[PDB]
């Protein structure tokens, strides 16, 4: 309220030597765990680490074609296996009647 | 019925990789998210013969062996940087490049790191994302009115 | 069977989204009013397996998570300043920084 | 301060609303497609015994 | 040389980004078609056993 | 079969172009902005016999 407009704190980020090998929890929380690294403090720009972007919110990275179509793909394979299992079934009952 | 066995197997393989799917598309517009991908190897394969080098007037020979089965050797998490959108509230950061967001439920003996960044005061003074967690950082000291990033 | 539930909770999730837009949307021009907004969250990951430390004569691995589902972490209203507008009526008052009635 | 005569109007913006039903309304579809494959597998699986 | 007192535009001509969105859109519909109709023999194919 | 990966191919890759389109139409007016393209080129082709 008076003129003045001091900093008032300051944002630590940190860096890991393997993403995605450090494991996930629930919420948007990431861990470290081995065959990940150790966390590293430093600054917000200067280690090799990117800066901050005020005022706005980062979206996540899911494109939803590939998605789709992978929809696709499980379901064709999964109706291929399912086929395997029903033919292996028929020649048992066969080999059971077989002898009457 | 070894067929039986490998068919079952390739079944649970794919239902698998529809559950992790499933996440995927599921959490979609979620902040920070980085979606995952599963992966398949072959099962150990039954060798009924050798292969055979040629011999007495006769040529080689192929090694006979079966096959048998199919299963999820790992899944991958994958961070290419998403997509920005602008919000109104100044306080929500969101990162450019690389690196994490540090978070602890007590005095920092247990950090979290996160990408997401929906930071927002309390009716105290505590700097807090969604659902507890206080972020990690540094305050200033009035004595010098300057920050101390080295501690 | 895990992909249905989880598909189920991403649409409720986004049901609850709706809500709050529609109501956004349905009171533009009362006095007065600031908007809301939806926040999700992951669901916690079930993790069949754990990450390990080379050994020998291997590398490491990776932790071999699923993940399942996405719920609604918190709404959030937002009080940025509106827009004005004169009246002819004397007795009405609009604040103009902070503070309420 | 106060600013007399005048009446202050909500802060919504529009353009901003009508994107967002856009969104909701294209995830809601895509999930909506998981649960419908989700339940073919199964049709696929209860029909695998006859 | 620099020129004083004014601003360089953009060089994005529009005309030959909007005839694009059309390319792209109608070359994405047709390898559509084909997905779609490779599935559809791959049905014929699991019901040929039925 | 492999008529569905050559065509799930094709789809990934428009889109892709679409992407960048999509950015070059969206900032617009910014100054010193140089717009970008799209560039596609064959996989590698099978051969079942030879010449």
């Known amino acids: ?100 | 019925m070894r067929s039986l066995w490998s068919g079952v197997s390739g079944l649970q393989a794919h239902q698998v990789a529809m559950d992790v799917e499933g996440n995927n598309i599921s959490n979609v517009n979620t902040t920070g998210f980085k979606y995952s991908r599963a992966d398949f190897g072959t099962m150990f394969s039954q060798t009924v013969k050798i292969a055979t080098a040629p011999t007495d007037g006769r040529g080689g020979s192929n090694p006979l062996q079966i096959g048998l089965g199919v299963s999820v050797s790992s899944t991958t998490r994958i961070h290419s940087q998403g997509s920005v959108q602008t919000t109104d509230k100044n306080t929500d950061v969101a990162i450019n490049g690389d690196g994490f967001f540090m978070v602890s439920d007590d005095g920092g003996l247990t950090n979290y790191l996160t990408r997401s960044g929906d930071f927002k005061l309390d009716a105290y003074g505590n700097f807090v994302n969604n659902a507890g967690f206080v972020v990690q950082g540094w305050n200033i000291n009035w004595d010098d009115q300057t920050i101390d990033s080295s501690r």
């Open chain 1, 1 to 100: 309220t008076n003129g003045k407009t001091f900093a008032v704190a300051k944002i630590a980020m940190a860096s890991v030597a393997n993403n995605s090998g450090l494991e996930e929890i629930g919420g948007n929380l990431f861990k470290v765990t081995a065959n990940s690294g150790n966390i590293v403090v430093g600054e917000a720009g200067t280690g090799g680490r990117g800066e901050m972007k005020t005022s706005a919110l980062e979206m996540s990275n899911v494109d939803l074609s590939r998605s789709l179509t992978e929809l696709i793909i499980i379901q064709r394979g999964y109706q291929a296996n399912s086929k395997t299992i029903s033919t292996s079934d028929q020649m048992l009952q066969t080999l059971i009647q077989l002898k009457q």
